[PDB]
C-alpha cells in the first residue's frame, strides 16, 4: 500500500491502545495485531489491524527487534505521528 502518516493523541496516563507483533528477529515488519476499544489508536482512527509500523515520530522501526520497537513506542508522549503502510 501507499505510506500514510497518522497522528495519535495520547493522554499521559494511557497507552497507545495497540498490540504489535513482528520485528527484525521475526523477518517481518512491526505489525499492528490489535486495536483496543476506547484507547488512542481507536479514538483517533487511521490505524488498522494489518498495518506495518515503519516509523514513529521519525524513529525508523523497519529494522528494529520487537523489544526495541516496544520500548520506543512506550516512550512516546502526547502527539505521536505513525508512518504506516497496509501490507
Amino acid at each position: 500500500g501507499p505510506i500514510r502518516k497518522v497522528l495519535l493523541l495520547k493522554e499521559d496516563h494511557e497507552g497507545l491502545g495497540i498490540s504489535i507483533t513482528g520485528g527484525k528477529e521475526h523477518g517481518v515488519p512491526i505489525l499492528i495485531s490489535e486495536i483496543h476499544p476506547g484507547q488512542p489508536a481507536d479514538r483517533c482512527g487511521g490505524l488498522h489491524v494489518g498495518d506495518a509500523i515503519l516509523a514513529v515520530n521519525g524513529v525508523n522501526l523497519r529494522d528494529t527487534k520487537h523489544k526495541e520497537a516496544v520500548t520506543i513506542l512506550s516512550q512516546q508522549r502526547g502527539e505521536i505521528e505513525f508512518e504506516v503502510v497496509y501490507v
Partner: peptide, 6 residues
Amino acid sequence: RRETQV
C-alpha cells in the same frame, strides 16, 4: 507468538 500491548 511474540505479541505486546503498548
